[PDB]
Amino acid sequence: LLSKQSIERITKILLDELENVRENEQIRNIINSWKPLPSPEKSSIYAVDGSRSVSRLSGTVIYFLSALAVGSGKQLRLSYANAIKSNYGTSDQIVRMQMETLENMLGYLAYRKLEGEKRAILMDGTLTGSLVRPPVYPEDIRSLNVMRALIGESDFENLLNEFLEKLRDHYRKVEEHLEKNGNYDSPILTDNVVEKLRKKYIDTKVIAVKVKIPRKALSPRVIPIEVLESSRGKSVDELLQELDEEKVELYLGKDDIYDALHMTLSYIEYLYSIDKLLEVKNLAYIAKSFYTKTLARTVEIVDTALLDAVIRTLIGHEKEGYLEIEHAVVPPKWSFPDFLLSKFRNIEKLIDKGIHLAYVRFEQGDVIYMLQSTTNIEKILPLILHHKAGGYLRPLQLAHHGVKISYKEARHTLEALINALRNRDPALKI
Amino acid sequence: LSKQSIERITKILLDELENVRENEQIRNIINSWKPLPSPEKSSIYAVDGSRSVSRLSGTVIYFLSALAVGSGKQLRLSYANAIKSNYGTSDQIVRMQMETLENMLGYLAYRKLEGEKRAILMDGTLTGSLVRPPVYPEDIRSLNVMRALIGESDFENLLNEFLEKLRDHYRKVEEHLEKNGNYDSPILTDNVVEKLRKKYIDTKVIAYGSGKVKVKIPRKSPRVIPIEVLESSRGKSVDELLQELDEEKVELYLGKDDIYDALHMTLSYIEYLYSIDKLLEVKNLAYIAKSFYTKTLARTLIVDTALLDAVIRTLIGHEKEGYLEIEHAVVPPKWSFPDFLLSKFRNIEKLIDKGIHLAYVRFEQGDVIYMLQSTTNIEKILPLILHHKAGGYLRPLQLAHHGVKISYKEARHTLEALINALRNRDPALK
């Protein structure tokens, strides 16, 4: 249906972005700082990615996660099937985290078995993307603070410490199955272990509820002027301190306390894979596109597509190469809580030092990709290159072809035994 | 697959049932299951919608369609548009306009309906978009931001002026449906925002260094100020600050793009609320949902149609058509709708006053169980909808579903092929 009307309004929407993204500063001048893509040294490599499938049966979400790493060594796969209680946003976000947790575990364990003088892991995605806004954002920090407040700081520290220990065990256990079988169907520790931890750190201290946390634990953005007129005689600093020091009481069901715990565990388990993956000396992320909205908000960066445009339009190139981005970027302390950080020292190192960012075009008329790494693109680029075959690299292509979801594994299937076991009825609520 | 996985997932689901089947509240109420009412003749329109979204680098290309089939001719609404990517915000403004199409169409369809008892049947739930609207937190903080920046008086002006363009817009839209029975510009905001931007924002705002503007804070009817105003004067005393506010000395430095979005979101929100308000004008209005059930639905102050259904044939082995009327009416949390807005929508006000009536309904013997929600008592609406029963299901909604799933994907070639035309082929393949 033609609709000559909306097209232009669309066109303009886009063109107003390109035509006007020239900044009036003309790119900042960074363009001519463009380079050719370097030589192709040699490296042993792994490309990992993920695919998920979610099905909603009424208030319960059934999902199947799959991580796979292709490259030099044998194929490795982590898989998790599971079901969760439905919250519109919070549900999706739990699943994303586990999705990333699986890949992080996996990039790492795949690095360990990676043999050669030069080892590198290739992640499909961005480092910054998950670091600026943690999936389940409001909810991970809230749960942690609820917990910290519930059982106290000191107990909490043990809870933490114990759980990390369980994580150490867990990784070693996963690794072994991977060498034996090349696959493991229980990559997620938290679901197995929440039950015991609840009875231990909570079930004792509780009665058949009310907790006090700081205001900041889930943000108004405005304040009624009464609070000001009411603070006359004080200093803005005292005010802002009272506002920060402000505390709140909450009332917590068994379900809410349970939820506070499982989130905490999940979030620790997640941050734990980040930390480990960060070991990889040569670490690479690749993405066609990312969100620039908060990126320039907490150095200035544009979008891959907008760059490519300005490339052919203004400078008439359309050719291979790359453009390094002059500034490393340092992650938000807001995202990663105070206490936890002393645990993950690679997170720590990242906050201290930064992530390296470069735009990259792999082939002649080929598109541009966004590359991030723990260390200088200068070093890491060539190794990634050593695997180039077609429009892009062999290992990467093979992770995107490989975990390319089949007709869902669980579609009529992991459902249809759920048909036979007991109740076809929830199955009916597709 | 795996058996332990299947056994856990099956464990997970059977526990859920088991708790339900434990019969806390549910012992009495299930026995209150009652036979369908004798049907009453009615003229009806069921409305449903679909959307397709496609992300191009940062941008979202989307298409909305709302269909109403029934006792009159088919009525259609379409909108195709593009909107920049913000993780939560994007997905959430599309939904809000979707809901907006369905709402109008339901309202418009009602007014073209000839009969003695006229009714509208909506795919959805009235509660779902109340308990957690397309809204929170973003668009309310938007509003508070907006109110704060341009101040109350000039905000009431924007509000009232926009509500005038809507009244006019609805009438325009009504005529195009009457001739052609379809209209391709049902959404107003996108076409009117830059105008209202210039009139309401540009006036009050001076340019600043990069992508930023200087904004003075206006003065005095609930007076509210950007928290940033406190954060930015820390050497000062509350007196100094209040006195600067009065003299209008206080300035702010905000992203040009942020103020714009805030505006946009504001209008989108008011426009979505107008539509709900207009829909509520329908005397016989019903929502039908095979599944809703968030854990937040219940908790506020009520089980899953899926659980109940599997319990009923379990406890009572009924599997009978019929309905169970939830005894008390649900009134939505006022946190949904801001105080200063409610005045502009009286039907949304009544809705709060009175409430929403809810029932579980099985339209035929073996069929699934639906959540049915209404502005009048189930006793009254249920027979009007029953007049249209066809399958284990109501004919018009069946046709609405079928008719909206008729969505065809020329969506690539639509813009992608044609938006190479003015300038840039690049964003197409990203």
One-letter amino acid of A163: F
Location of structure tokens 């009327």: B325
- Report the residue from B190, B225, B368 with minimal CB separation from A223: B225
How far apart are alpha carbons A120 and A398 in whole angstroms? Answer: 16
B343 in helix, strand or coil?
coil
Chain B residues within 8 A of A219 when measuring between CB atoms = 137
Instruction: Name every chain A residue with its beta carbon within 8 A of the beta carbon of B309.
Output: 425, 428-429
Upstream peptide bond of B383 is cis (omega within 30 degrees of 0): no
B101 within 8 A of B64, measured Cβ to Cβ: yes
Is A239 in contact with B222 (Cβ distance < 8 A)? no
Task: List the 286-305 stretch of B: residues with Cβ below 8 A of A.
Answer: 290-296, 299, 304-305
Residue in A with minimal Cα distance to B245: A225
In sequence order, which ranges of B256-394 are alpha helices (DSSP H)?
Answer: 256-279, 295-300, 305-315, 339-342, 346-353, 378-386
Q: H helices of B112-151, where?
A: 128-131, 138-150
Q: Domain for residue B375, yes or no?
A: yes
Q: Give the H/E segment covering residue B167.
A: helix B152-180
- Sequence length of chain A is 430
- Reported residue count of chain B is 430
Asked whether A287 and A124 are in contact (CB, 8 A), the reply is yes
- Decide if B430 contacts B85 (C-beta within 8 A): no
Q: Which two tokens stand for residue A148?
A: 């910290």
Q: Do B57 and A288 touch (CB under 8 A)?
A: yes
Report the sign of the C-alpha dihedral through residues B138, B144, B146, B148, in that order.
negative
CB A427 within 8 A of CB A57: yes
- A59 to chain B, closest Cα gap in Å: 5
The Cα of B163 is separated from the nearest Cα of chain A by a number of Å equal to 23
| Nearest to A178, CA basis, from A190, A169, A189, A186 | A186
Residues 6+ apart with CB under 8 A from A226: none
Query: CB distance B291–A11 less than 8 Å?
Result: no
Query: Residues 41 to 80 of A: which have CB under 8 A from any B CB?
Result: 56-60, 62
Between CA A288 and CA B138 the distance in angstroms is 28
Residue pair B214/B205 in contact by the 8 Å Cβ criterion: yes
Report CA-CA distances (Å) from B377 to A34, A55, A301, B33, B130. Answer: 69, 33, 56, 16, 19
Structure tokens at A387: 């695997």
Please count the other Cβ atoms lying within 10 Å of the Cβ belonging to residue B89: 18
Coil, strand or helix: which one is B80?
A: strand
Minimal Cα–Cα distance from B370 to chain A, Å? 10
Residue of B16, B184, B238 with shortest CB distance to A228: B238
Name the experiment that determined this structure: X-ray
A363 and A184 Cβ atoms separated by less than 8 Å: no
CB-based burial label for A357 (10 Å; 0-12, 13-18, 19+): buried
Q: Given an 8 Å threshold on Cβ–Cβ distance, is A428 in contact with B368? A: yes
Phi-psi category of residue B269: left, alpha or beta, with phi > 0 → left and psi -120 to 50 → alpha: alpha
Please, how many CA atoms are within 13 Å of residue B342, restricted to the half-sphere of its CB? Answer: 13
Nearest alpha carbon to residue A82 among A73, A91, A90:
A91
Q: Resolution of the coordinates in A?
A: 2.8
Distance between CA atoms of residues B67 and B109, nearest Å: 10
Distances (CA, A) of A107 to A77, A337, A399, B58, B165: 10, 24, 12, 27, 55
Of the candidates B57, B91, B82, the residue with the CA atom closest to the CA atom of residue B415 = B82
How many whole angstroms separate alpha carbon B365 and alpha carbon A419? 20
Residue B8 sits at the chain A interface (C-beta within 8 Å): yes
Question: Is B188 within 8 Å of chain A by CB?
Answer: no
d(CA A11, CA A137): 34
Report which of B383, B138, B61 is spatially closest to residue A11, judged by C-alpha positions: B61
Nearest Cα neighbor of B260 from B84, B62, B63 is B84
DSSP state of A230: T
Angle at A62 (CA atoms; ends A270, B134), nearest 5 degrees: 80
Cα–Cα distance, A98 to A198 (Å, whole number): 20
Count helices and strands in chain B by DSSP H and E runs:
18, 13
Q: Is B427 within 8 Å of A305 when comparing Cβ atoms? A: yes
A 10 A CB-CB count for B365 gives 11
Tally of CB atoms within 10 A around B3: 9
Range B269-287 burial, b when 16+ CB lie within 10 A, else e: bbbbbbbbbbbbebebbbb
B25 touches B48 (CB < 8 A) = no
Find the discontinuities in chain A where C to next N exceeds 2.5 angstroms and give the residue preceding each: 208, 218, 298
Contacts of A423 in chain B (CB under 8 A): 13-14, 17, 310, 314
The count of CB pairs under 8 A between chains A and B is: 239
Structure tokens at A315: 């400078």
d(CA B323, CA B32): 9
Question: Strand, coil or helix: what is A44?
Answer: strand
Residue B223 has its nearest CB partner, among A225, A236, A425, at: A225
- As to burial, measured by CB atoms within 10 angstroms (0-12 exposed, 13-18 middle, 19+ buried), residue A417 is middle
Q: Cβ separation of B426 and A83 shorter than 8 Å? A: no
* Residue A104 backbone phi and psi in degrees, to 5: -55, -50
- Name the residue among B4, B78, B226 with its Cβ closest to that of A221: B226
Q: What is Dmax (Cα atoms) for chain A?
A: 72
Tell me the chain B residues in contact with residue A413 when contact means C-beta distances shorter than 8 Å: 1
Residues A398 and A46: beta-carbon distance below 8 Å = no
Write out the two tokens for B67. 């269909």
With left for phi above 0 and alpha for psi between -120 and 50, is residue B181 left, alpha or beta? left
A207 touching chain B per CB within 8 A = no
Q: What is the DSSP string of A75-104?
A: -EEEEEEEEEE--HHHHHHHHHHHHHHHHH
Amino acid, res. A264: T
The identity of residue A307, as a single letter, is L
Other beta carbons within 10 angstroms of residue A74's beta carbon come to: 12
Cα dihedral: A398, A399, A404, A409 (round 10): 120
CA–CA gap between residue A391 and residue A362 (Å, rounded)? 7
Q: Chain A within 8 Å of B236 (Cβ-Cβ)? A: yes
CA pair distance B309, A58, nearest whole angstrom? 11
Q: How far apart are CA A253 and CA B257, in angstroms?
A: 42
- Cβ pair A224, B148 in contact under 8 A: no
> What ranges make up the beta strands (E) of B153-260?
182-183, 205-207, 212-216, 224-226, 251-255
Compute the radius of gyration of chain B from its Cα atoms: 25
Picking from A1, A58, A305, the nearest residue to B426 by CB comes out as A305
Residues 6+ apart with CB under 8 A from A291: A129, B58, B85, B86, B87
Which residues on A lie below 8 Å from B307 (Cβ)?
Answer: 58-59, 426
B137: preceding bond cis by omega (within 30 degrees): yes
Spatial separation of the C-alpha atoms in residues A162 and A173, rounded to whole Å: 17
CB atoms within 10 A of CB B223: 17
Cβ contacts of B238 within 8 Å, gap of 6 or more: A228, A231, A232, A233, A234, A235, A236, A239
B418 part of contact set with chain A, CB < 8 Å: yes
Q: Do A59 and B184 touch (CB under 8 A)?
A: no
Which residues on B lie below 8 Å from A13 (Cβ)? 59, 81-83
Q: Amino acid letter at B242?
A: L
Alpha helices per DSSP H over A278-393: 304-315, 345-352, 377-385
Structure token digits, residue B192: 């009117």
Q: How far is A421 from A25, CA to CA, in rounded Å? A: 66
Amino acid type, B114:
E
Contact flag A414-B191 (C-beta cutoff 8 Å): no
Dihedral sign from CA coordinates of A2, A4, A9, A11: positive
Strands A368-373 and A222-224: unpaired
Candidate from B2, B58, B191 with C-beta closest to A303: B58
Find the closest chain B residue to A184 by CA distance: B2
Contact A14 B82 (CB under 8 A): yes
- Min distance A409 CA to chain B CA atoms (Å): 8
Q: Which contiguous run of DSSP H or E holds residue B107?
A: helix B87-111
Paired tokens of B199: 């009139």
A336 CB-side CA count, 13 A: 27
On whether the CB atoms of residues B185 and B114 are closer than 8 A, the answer is no
Q: Which of A83, A82, A135 is nearest to A104 (CA)?
A: A135
Q: Per the structure block, which two tokens stand in for B418?
A: 């044609």
| Among candidates A7, A232, A255 on the partner chain, residue whose Cβ is nearest the Cβ of B242 | A232
The answer to whether A416 faces chain B, any CB pair under 8 Å, is no
Pairing of strands A222-224, B224-226: antiparallel
Residues B271 and B104 sit within 8 Å (Cβ to Cβ) = no
Neighbours of B56 (CB within 10 A): 21
Nearest Cα residue in chain B from A133 = B87
Alpha-carbon distance values, A371 to A125, A336, A368, A392, B59 (Å)? 9, 23, 10, 13, 20
- Across the interface, do A410 and B296 touch by the CB < 8 Å criterion? no
Shortest Cα distance from A165 to chain B (angstroms)? Answer: 24
Instruction: Kindly determine whether residue A425 and residue B306, on different chains, have CB atoms separated by under 8 Å.
Output: yes
Rounded CA separation B291/A55 (Å): 13
CA distance B326 to B357: 7
Residues that constitute the known binding site of A for Mn(2+) = 49, 124
A343: tokens are 């645990």
Choose, out of A423, A424, A430, the residue to mutate when testing the contact with B (most B CBs < 10 Å).
A423
Q: How far is CA A245 from CA A214, A239, A252, in A?
A: 7, 10, 22
| DSSP H helical ranges for A222-376 | 225-229, 236-245, 254-277, 304-315, 345-352
Q: Which residues pair with A211 in a beta bridge?
A: A250
Residue ranges for the known binding site of B for Mn(2+) are 48, 123
Q: Residue A163 and residue B98: Cα distance in Å, rounded?
A: 44
Query: For residue B286, is it left (φ>0), alpha (ψ between -120 and 50) or beta?
Result: beta
- From first CA to last CA, the distance across chain A in angstroms is 32
Residue B30, domain extent: 22-218+226-414
| Structural tokens at position B36 | 């369908």
> In 10 A of CB A11, how many CB atoms?
18
DSSP secondary structure code for residue B404 in this structure: H
* DSSP label of A22: T
- Check if A83 contacts B (Cβ < 8 Å): yes
Classify strands B251-255 and B43-56 as parallel, antiparallel or unpaired: unpaired
Of the candidates B144, B237, B304, which has its C-beta nearest A58's C-beta? B304
Helix (H) or strand (E) holding B345: none
Contact by Cβ (8 Å): B183, B68: no
Distance of CA A342 to the CA centre of its chain: 20
Q: How far, in Å, CA of B385 to CA of B394, rounded?
A: 8
**Long-range contacts from B155-158, C-beta under 8 angstroms, 24+ separation:** B157/B200, B158/B196, B158/B200, B158/B266
- Alpha-carbon span A418 to B10, nearest angstrom: 7
Sign of CA dihedral A120, A124, A130, A132: positive
Q: Any idea which residue has 């033609």 for tokens?
A: A2
- Total domains in the fold of chain B: 1
The backbone torsions φ and ψ at residue A360, rounded to the nearest 5 degrees and listed phi first, read: -145, 130
Question: Does the beta-carbon distance from A10 to B81 stay under 8 Å?
Answer: yes
Nearest to B429 among A58, A185, A367 (CB): A367
Q: Would you call A194 an interface residue with chain B, using a CB distance cutoff of 8 Å?
A: no
Question: Would the CB atoms of B9 and A303 count as touching at under 8 Å?
Answer: no
DSSP for A102-117, written as a single string: HHHHHHHHHHHT--SS
Backbone CA torsion sign across A372, A378, A384, A385: positive
